[PDB]
Design a protein around this ligand. Structure first.
Ligand SMILES: O=C(O)[C@@H](O)[C@H](O)[C@H](O)COP(=O)(O)O
Ligand SMILES: O=C(O)[C@@H](O)[C@H](O)[C@H](O)COP(=O)(O)O
Ligand SMILES: CN(C)Cc1ncccc1O
Ligand SMILES: CN(C)Cc1ncccc1O
Ligand SMILES: [Cl-]
Ligand SMILES: [Cl-]
Lengths: 550, 550
């Protein structure tokens, strides 16, 4: 099914190795700007969203020029990025190891284009779930859906883990400006009983709604947590008939939902072709629709749809997510940089790096290609980040003066939702965004340090290399539509990387393994008898725990 | 001045390069356990805290054996780790570029040992500040300190950034079990006005106390934020005489505190020899003393002091923070692993990786040695993480099946503060801790994948290499004392790495530059005139921002 086996044996890969040696390794971004008066225009692109809002993607402080980008585009052609993308959008089963379609793009098909899986259009089935989400979220928000004592819901608790948790977390944080007073969202995800205890501590069963978010509806942590929540609820409500007003399910598995005691009328469904890390667009985003309202959730979907259309219809050389993915390959595979940093200059987006860390690393942390052979090259990068300006005071020291190349994406909105003090804070925030990427590029040489007053041995400690690359992403405003487009940009960047490496970006056998590993040891923790059934470390740790546990 | 110039000048560094090729590169941990029945005992150590509680540090699933560890210890001797450590504890000015002592260890000197800077003991000066912290925090907690309308304080807001923020955040989250209902803590740190707006939205000026946390008391972000808080307060209170009941300062700069309008009686001092990322033990920890009580905060200090005593007095071969630091150097410098993962199996510790990311990367992200020459070897690693079990469902995919070595530390308490359902959740959490480190070691070979039912091209996709290293840290319970010892473990690990590399772990010239960069561009943002004073990218981003800003 694959058209090639190994990225390293694409003809352009060895050409890029040669370009790395002659041009890339010692690339001077300062010299690039000096050579090319049109560099900013040539290496920046304006994305226009469906609502005519705009996002500037400026790649011009990267270690890249026309020659390098053209070679990377050739590599993408040789790798059949476009063929794989088209197959994704056709509903083909490109998740080859689970024999599944990969159809998050269908979730945000608000245009109702024909988008078939197994030869049947999905547009109406997706739309019908959205209709249900709108009805229900409207009823929560207008008080027509009351708790078992006729009170409006005040608190919504999502219970889920991984893909069934982190999108809801990140997007409700990101779009918190769009929420209403008195209607709050909460998250229980960890099996650690602290998460249950602390989240429920101050909540009222009469005014709390639970969403049990689980694709399979069999995940140990989620079902255990959901049982705990049901117990807490019934401790006050007493009668199980009242569960129908307080528990809903977001799932693909109706039989297990109903077995759990949730009415099928209170199930919001989705399909197997929605990966967890691509799921916030589905029924899994119900907490978002409740928190900010369905219209805002729908605008978020439409932002993703617009970026999908950009990705599908734009030649590679001007295709924004492809460009980002090509740069990632350049750094990962030619420079040997193992990490990718994402820094929102935006407090609402504080969980955006963690969300991307799941999307990226879970997709692309693979060692086997679509030809079912092991790679002889690096795949997925380690993605990390925190918001600025905080990050500037902390690990930015190492970004500026350490020994590791750390490609970084900085993101700013031109307009704040909270423009206090006639935009005093916002102008200060913006000034940091510009100045930090400028400093990473320009650096500060020995002569400048001397001129500034340092002498003798102090001088080298105050030098900065510069030529440290960044990508700057400037939005007008982080609206629902903008956020939709930004997530989809990273989805399709991730797609591009995986396509070049010839991996399946859409399975997760290490995550699936983790969901079956613990039960064997759990059974050994039912008593305090020493164990010797494992390696000596695992035995030592279990046995020490048995001595120290309650 | 330094006893050697470059780590590469030390004879054992070249010997380790040879050991890496002969034994390390292909190291089999499975074979190591099969060869050595005492391996768990030989590569695990029990730490005993001042309160007779215990922490097990199990390094036996690392890519290490007796030969390797003996060589790394020799390298520590050659690098003069012990000499530098002793100088640290002696109060010598080992922060050579700022000409400062490095004396966070003096902040937790509850035994009142003689600990002099510039030949003058610091014990009583440190202790006097702690007396003041105890008196003030007790008065907040018991209601004897009232707001300007005669009400007890309900909410305490710390305003500060970087080292003046993240310790307070992480430690109050970690020790939240020790808090009391009705006395909450909050943090404003980002310059982004969202942080101010969202934090203050539901607070009452009459019952809110602000702590303005700033070593210098000049940081742009903090003073801007503090001024916004003052203005919010005065909008309600009216008269500045009322500030004295609602604002305190945590600082080294009395003149600037008083200039801001805070009474010197409400200043809690510290000295220049406390680095921000080592400051939560000082007056900067006041929010912790208020939230959980001074006695708990003192027990936290005593845990650090006990780990200090361990680091100072233990031969290198059994010195727990040194062992951790030597393994980090092994992976960073000989395997070329760029990252270090920390995963607390503990929801309260969810900000622990972020705190350690600052400690580590801001200390050790340096390219110049104490002999004032550039390193052409790797220094600080990129540290990241998130809590388990969540992480198991996300980026653990790449940990298990990607192409990058990611040395990982897993941390579990045997006892939960929230042992709900007769410890059902806690046994489940623990089972995951043991099972994940076991699986990273043993992996899953081709034969086992076939036996489990896969055929043909599916098989390689479900294989796991194993021999992926972990360190397991098992505490009895994450009490204040335990957390103190755990942070000090990472401080001294960080110390060890930097001593081997011969860098100054205690300066931060990139963070310092950050604090003076934005001012030029901030003045350019005072109008909407196009700018041409920078490189074309910086100009283009500024100019697009001016078109899109309010
Ligand atoms: O990325 C993944 O597949 C996981 O993080 C899942 O979302 C997680 O295990 C929860 O699975 P489920 O939604 O089936 O409960
Ligand atoms: O690590 C550092 O030195 C910084 O993060 C500082 O803590 C931060 O810049 C705040 O400085 P100050 O405490 O002087 O306000
Ligand atoms: C005509 N549609 C836009 C109505 C509608 N609204 C929300 C969800 C689905 C749906 O069909
Ligand atoms: C003698 N000391 C233990 C009393 C004391 N308590 C708290 C802080 C300082 C201090 O001296
Ligand atoms: Cl629509
Ligand atoms: Cl004491």
């Amino acid at each position: 099914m694959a058209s090639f086996k190994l990225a390293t044996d694409l003809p352009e890969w060895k050409k890029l190795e040669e370009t790395y040696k002659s041009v890339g390794e010692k690339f001077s971004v300062r010299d690039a700007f000096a050579k090319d008066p049109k560099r900013f225009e040539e290496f920046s692109w304006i994305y226009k969203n469906y609502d005519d809002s705009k996002i500037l993607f400026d790649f011009s402080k990267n270690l890249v020029n026309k020659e390098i980008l053209d070679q990377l585009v050739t590599l993408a052609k040789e790798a059949g990025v476009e063929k794989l993308r088209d197959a994704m959008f056709a509903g083909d089963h490109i998740n080859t190891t689970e024999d599944r379609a990969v159809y998050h793009v269908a979730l945000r098909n608000r245009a109702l284009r024909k988008m078939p899986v197994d030869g049947k259009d999905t547009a109406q089935e997706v739309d019908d779930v959205l209709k249900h989400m709108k009805e229900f979220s409207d009823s929560i928000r207008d008080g027509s859906w009351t708790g078992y004592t006729g009170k409006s819901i005040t608190d919504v608790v999502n219970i889920g883990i991984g893909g069934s948790d982190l999108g809801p977390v990140m997007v409700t944080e990101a779009l918190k400006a769009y929420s209403k007073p008195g209607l709050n969202v909460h998250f229980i995800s960890n099996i650690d009983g602290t998460h249950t205890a602390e989240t429920l501590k101050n909540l009222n069963p009469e005014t709390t709604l639970f969403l049990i978010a689980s694709k399979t509806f069999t995940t140990a942590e989620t079902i255990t947590n959901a049982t705990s929540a049901k117990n807490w609820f019934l401790a006050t409500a007493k009668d199980s008939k009242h569960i129908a007003k307080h528990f809903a399910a977001l799932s693909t598995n109706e039989k297990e939902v109903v077995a759990f005691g949730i009415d099928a009328k209170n199930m919001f469904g989705f399909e197997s072709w929605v990966g967890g890390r691509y799921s916030v667009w589905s029924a899994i985003g119900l907490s978002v629709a409740i928190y900010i309202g369905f219209e805002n959730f729908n605008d978020f979907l439409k932002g993703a749809e617009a970026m999908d259309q950009h990705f599908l219809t734009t030649p590679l050389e001007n295709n924004i997510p492809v460009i980002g993915g090509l740069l990632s390959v350049w750094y990962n595979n030619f420079f040997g940089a193992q990490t990718h940093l994402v820094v929102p200059f935006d407090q609402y987006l504080h969980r955006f790096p963690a969300y991307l860390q799941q999307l990226s690393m879970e997709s692309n942390g693979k060692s086997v290609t679509r030809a079912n052979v092991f790679t002889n090259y690096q795949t997925g990068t380690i993605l990390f980040g925190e918001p600025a300006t905080n990050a500037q005071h902390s690990f930015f020291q190492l970004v500026h003066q350490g020994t590791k190349l750390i490609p970084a994406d900085f993101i700013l909105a031109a307009q704040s939702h909270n423009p206090i003090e006639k935009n005093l804070h916002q102008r200060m925030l913006a000034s940091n965004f510009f100045a930090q990427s400028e400093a990473l590029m320009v650096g500060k040489d020995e002569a400048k340090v001397k001129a500034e007053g340092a002498t003798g041995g102090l001088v080298p400690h105050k030098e900065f290399s510069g030529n440290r690359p960044t990508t700057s992403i400037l939005a007008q405003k982080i609206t629902p539509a903008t956020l939709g487009s930004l997530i989809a940009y990273y989805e399709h960047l991730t797609f591009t990387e995986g396509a070049i490496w010839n991996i399946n970006s859409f399975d997760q056998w290490g995550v699936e393994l983790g969901k079956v590993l613990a039960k064997v040891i759990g059974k050994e923790l039912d008593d305090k008898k020493a164990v010797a059934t494992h390696d000596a470390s695992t035995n030592g740790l279990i046995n020490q725990f048995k001595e120290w546990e309650e």
